[PDB]
Design a binder for these strands. Structure first.
Lengths: 93, 80, 104, 96, 104, 93, 80, 96
DNA sequence: TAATGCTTGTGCCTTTATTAAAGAGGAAAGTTGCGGTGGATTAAAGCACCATCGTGCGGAGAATACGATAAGGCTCTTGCTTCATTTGAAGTTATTGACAGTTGAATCGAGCCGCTCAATTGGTCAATTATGGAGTCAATAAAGG
DNA sequence: CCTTTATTGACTCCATAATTGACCAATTGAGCGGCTCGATTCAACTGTCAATAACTTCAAATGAAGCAAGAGCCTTATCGTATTCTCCGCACGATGGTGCTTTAATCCACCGCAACTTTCCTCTTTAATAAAGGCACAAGCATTA
């Protein structure tokens, strides 16, 4: 079987941020675990938010509220800004 | 509203300490205990307000506070 | 075809995130912009952690990121440290600190 | 006239307040504090009464637990008087 | 019409538990015996807590269970205390204890 | 409209444990909250168990394993015994 | 395979204390540090075994240990 | 001949072991301990190598954190030598 | 300060193995179109939150005498650190074999989905009994002698 | 031990409000059937876990000696405690106003389902170079004088 990871995307992000720095296999696995953990946390928080308001759907507002509730402070502010930028770019295209 | 943290008087902090089994209390404690309390509220009310902002409401309900407490591992029974 | 990731200007797999969200059964329906928002947030967090880790690696005159550099980057940042306070990172060690009392 | 040795009335108060279940902080000052804190997150917030009651219950329970840990820390250092450093140590071990 | 609670000999609402499990979207399909097992576990836990609370109320020369008795029953039992260590009981107070050092 | 609570059922249980003891409204609410919290914990654990093995079904085995993982010690043992008894009685009827 | 708890030698406990910043170590500590360690393992391995019993397996995998650690708020990265 | 003062080599070891990332407990004794503990829950259990590695990583991280809290508790009581009562206090405040 | 022992920081060769790079395929993402449910909008009314006032009374604030607790200093003795020697047990490499995890099929059990009925429970009103406020007494504990 | 004084548990009474019981409705759980999935069993492949042996050599055990730190004791001074007096604002009871929260009806819009396409990602393989090992070596720190 074939396993699914974020290895290529993490490598792309790293090469975009630090062009001249590579990453080891163990560090890439740790980064993949971190991404998976954050994804699960955000998804569970969004599911709880949808359940509380009796809404059968998860929209960008649910994800934004989950980001505010999970990520702390300036990290949450920047994450919300990036998410809003990406959603606007996706809609306008 | 302004300066309502002092509304948590020294007798109230003394009573809270006595309920916790404290026999002697230093003079400085009443100050520190206030600040700590404030921090706790800042961690809960914020979360509660977040829920209130997600439901598009302007009234903070008991359910928002209960969910905010549960998010921090501070589950509260009796308001469910 | 034009990929949704490319349309949103993201390096993360919006399609794969949509598949994961739908397979996880987090809700009956999934919005159009929810996977895009999640991918953007994940990309931002990965970029922040990788930037701090690269700074730590370059500090030690290394050209490769190892778990030690990830640990140093996470524990030396206030927001990242708060987010990952209860997380143990394998082969990472601990922050080098000594109580001032113990020093001679 | 009659005077009680220091600590006797303290022990009586410890016994009395551990037996009761009532709230120890006055309601109106706590409500004002909660409203003042919340005004920094969103302007013109109305608070349901049960919400303020739940906040007071949670805050009092948290402070009582913190004072229990502080008393343990103070007794550890061969003292009976709790000090701000005891609270700081208790909050550090708790991960706050 | 034999109700599903009478079939298993439970006082708890197996039908309502099934409806709650279905509405919670915990899984795509729900087995026949899962709600019965959940109802039995919930009934057992409620019976244990109520037995301890009634013992506490009787020890206090009372014939009505109040939150104080529930708190005493929870905190005086090892396994229930472990289960609900991080739970606050409203109007329950605290377990009466004093450190031996503080006593005269 | 209609608030879904276990208020009757818990009361029934009380009348089979302490026939001569009543329960107050506040204690009723606390018991209802406790039952709801335990139900949510067990259901989430069973959902994670089903997800881990890629099983789309929650059976009595999933609930039994969730009970073992959540309830501690003798509480878990007695709860497992009660659940097995109830499931056997339900199947035999 | 008995009393394997003594395999956690005094130098190993000393090194673990040094990583934590400990300067002086009492003689009794090496005993106590063992017991608590055992308790920790008893809390994790059990849960791991539970997962292994649910999958109808007889081999304890690393993923089971990761899940068991996650249940106790001890998330581990690098084995996921 | 040269003799370092007590605590100099201790500080050197603290500095050395805080910068390294290697495991500090020997692998084979820890593996035997894990197998002995697991034999009480289920008989004839096989362990993956990565499972034992993860258990060792988690146990070492937990012990290092516990020793950090113990050192804080010992310094609080105006000492530099950690004692079993320091570990007991740290575990009590942590909720264990 | 100062020589001196010492552990650690640093420059360079080797190799290596751990990562950088390429290819086939195959699995998953993008596109198209339709239907039907869910979200957004507006009206409405009732229910609850905020602001106001009276008051009067229990709790908070401030002073005061003080005693006992916390902190600093001294000693001593003993428990823990540092170093040296012996050893014995962990680490590494190569090997065997058998147990068990995984994948592939068939299939029969089993749970999902629709529609109907009515039996169970939830909102509302009345009430009585366990409980709270209040007054009074005896038992208990503490503090000075 | 004695003796006085403050505190609290207990007893009883009067009120009281809070839990229990009864009744209408409303809604949802049980029943029946059809249908498509899934989880159970069997078997074969092979991945790898456990056991084995041998060699090495490095870290653990033990002991001696040294030394400094933890604990017990003493003193003091200061600062939290218990009590009293004054006052002040919290809380309970009544009221008004309004805004905002929930419900209902309407409409549209947006996402799930299904099939086809196509192209992007993931094992398998090859290579190449950053760093670990090894060696040699300079430099700052600790130690006794």
């Amino acid at each position: 079987k074939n396993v699914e990871t974020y290895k290529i995307y993490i490598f792309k992000v790293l090469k975009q941020v630090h062009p001249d720095i590579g990453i080891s296999s163990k560090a890439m696995g740790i980064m993949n675990s971190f991404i998976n953990d954050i994804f699960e946390k955000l998804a569970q928080e969004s599911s709880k938010l949808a359940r509380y308001n009796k809404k059968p759907t998860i929209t960008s507002r649910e994800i934004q509220t989950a980001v505010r509730l999970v990520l702390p402070g300036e990290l949450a502010k920047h994450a919300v800004s990036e998410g809003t930028k990406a959603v606007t770019k996706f809609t306008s295209s | 509203l302004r300066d309502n943290i002092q509304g948590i008087t020294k007798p109230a902090i003394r009573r809270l300490a006595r309920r916790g089994g404290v026999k002697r209390i230093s003079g400085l404690i009443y100050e520190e205990t206030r600040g700590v309390l404030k921090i706790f509220l800042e961690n809960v009310i914020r979360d509660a307000v977040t829920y209130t902002e997600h439901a598009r409401r302007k009234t903070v309900t008991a359910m928002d506070v209960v969910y905010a407490l549960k998010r921090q591992g501070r589950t509260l029974y009796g308001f469910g | 075809s034009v990929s949704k990731s490319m349309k949103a200007g993201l390096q993360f797999p919006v399609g794969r995130i949509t598949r994961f969200l739908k397979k996880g059964r987090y809700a009956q329906r999934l919005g159009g912009g929810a996977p895009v928002y999640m991918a953007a947030v994940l990309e931002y967090l990965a970029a922040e952690v990788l930037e701090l880790a690269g700074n730590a690696a370059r500090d030690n005159k290394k050209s490769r990121i190892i778990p030690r550099h990830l640990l140093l980057a996470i524990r030396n940042d206030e927001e990242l440290g708060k987010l990952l306070s209860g997380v143990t990172i394998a082969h990472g060690g601990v922050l080098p600190n000594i109580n001032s009392v113990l020093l001679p | 006239p009659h005077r009680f040795r220091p600590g006797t009335v303290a022990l009586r108060e410890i016994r009395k307040y551990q037996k009761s279940t009532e709230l120890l902080i006055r309601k109106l000052p706590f409500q004002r504090l909660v409203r003042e804190i919340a005004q920094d997150f969103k302007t013109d917030l109305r608070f349901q009464s049960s919400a303020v009651a739940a906040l007071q219950e949670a805050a009092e329970a948290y402070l009582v637990g913190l004072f229990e840990d502080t008393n343990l820390c103070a007794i550890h250092a061969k003292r009976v008087t709790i000090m701000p450093k005891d609270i700081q140590l208790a909050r550090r071990i708790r991960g706050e």
